[PDB]
């Protein structure tokens, strides 16, 4: 109903269409990417500095760390939106790694439409300190994008890329894409 064909447009990058969105996966350091939004997978206190969250907070800088702690004390947040600091993005969206991954991705997509953004880059949310299983995480990320497209909600969002630290996790995402392909 929505899925195109899986191919490789560049070395180490794999892609397929999901409605009007191009969905891509690759392995690398997410802090070197450029996108309108970069997603951080963190703790419910928004101050985890371990694995991909360490890299994101160190690169983003102390003003972003300060933004995170200020918002965390103000209210009970499922996720937080901050500036990009010294990352190459307009905003960072900090999601809780232990939360339902489909719900977290749905929220990121809706916030990006609100800002008329076109590109998103995310890690394999929940596979680090939260220790969620990689194929459940891949299934949830892709399901969220399918639902967003099915509801007619994709207008400004055109590109969603997962940059994955461990090559063995990339292999799981590629197999999930092949399961779905048209």
Binding-site residues: 29-30, 41, 52, 126-130, 165
Annotated binding site for a glycoprotein: 29-30, 41, 52, 126-130, 165
Asked if residue 134 binds Cl ion (CB under 5 A), the reply is: no
Q: Looking at beta carbons only, is 59 or 157 nearer to ligand GW1?
A: 59
Asked if residue 128 binds Cl ion (CB under 5 A), the reply is: yes
Q: Which one, of 123, 157, 160, 151, lies nearest residue 42 by Cα?
A: 123
CB atoms within 10 A of CB 44: 14
Report the nearest approach of ligand GW1 to the CB of residue 128 (Å): 5
Q: Indicate which single residue of 6, 21, 39, 52 sits in contact with ligand GW1 (rule: CB under 6 A).
A: 52
CA distance 157 to 122: 14
CA distance 37 to 35: 5
Asked if residue 166 binds ligand GW1 (CB under 6 A), the reply is: yes
Question: At how many degrees (to 10) do helices 101-114 and 134-150 cross?
Answer: 40
Restricting to residues 104-133, which ones interact with ligand GW1 according to CB under 6 A?
128
Asked if residue 98 binds ligand GW1 (CB under 6 A), the reply is: no
Handedness of CA 21, 22, 25, 29 (dihedral sign): negative
The residues binding Cl ion (CB under 5 A) are 41, 97, 123-124, 126, 128-130, 164-165
């Amino acid at each position: 109903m929505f899925y195109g064909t899986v191919s490789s447009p560049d070395s180490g990058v794999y892609e397929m269409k999901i409605g009007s969105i191009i969905f891509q996966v690759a392995s690398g350091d997410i802090t070197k990417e450029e996108a309108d939004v970069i997603v951080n997978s963190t703790s419910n206190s928004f101050n985890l500095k371990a694995g991909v969250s360490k890299a994101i907070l160190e690169c983003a800088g102390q003003n972003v760390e300060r933004e995170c702690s200020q918002q965390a004390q103000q209210r009970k947040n499922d996720y937080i939106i901050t500036g990009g600091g010294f990352l190459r993005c307009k905003n960072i969206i900090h999601v809780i790694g232990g939360n339902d991954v489909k719900s977290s991705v749905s929220s990121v997509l809706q916030e990006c439409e609100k800002k008329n953004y076109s590109s998103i880059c995310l890690p394999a949310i929940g596979t680090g300190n939260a220790k969620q299983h990689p194929d459940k995480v891949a299934e949830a990320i892709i399901d969220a994008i399918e639902d967003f497209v099915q509801k007619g909600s994709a207008q400004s969002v055109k590109k969603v890329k997962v940059v994955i630290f461990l090559p063995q996790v990339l292999d799981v995402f590629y197999a999930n894409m092949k399961k779905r392909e048209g």
